[PDB]
């Protein structure tokens, strides 16, 4: 049901900004005024992806969301 920002912008769970600026502008340059004029329902997917930054463009967010919380790994050692 949900998606994965690191996957949203083709960003490795710990990728960087490039794929963040490349992976959104890649599907976004293809979704710009090409269909938006016949379907805004997809609009959100545009910021749904961009928002991925609040998650990966922050040492605490990209380091926290990388494992979706300490539950994805639990006790480490």
Swiss-Prot record:
The lineage of its organism: Bacteria, Pseudomonadati, Pseudomonadota, Gammaproteobacteria, Enterobacterales. Residues 2-71 form the J domain. This is Chaperone protein DnaJ. Belongs to the DnaJ family. The J domain is necessary and sufficient to stimulate DnaK ATPase activity. Zinc center 1 plays an important role in the autonomous, DnaK-independent chaperone activity of DnaJ. Zinc center 2 is essential for interaction with DnaK and for DnaJ activity. It is found in: Cytoplasm. Disruption phenotype: Single dnaJ and double dnaK-dnaJ disruption are non-essential; synthetic lethality is seen in a triple tig-dnaK-dnaJ disruption, although this depends on temperature (triple disruptions grow slowly at 20 and 34 degrees Celsius but not at 43 degrees) and strain background. It comes from Escherichia coli (strain K12). Homodimer.
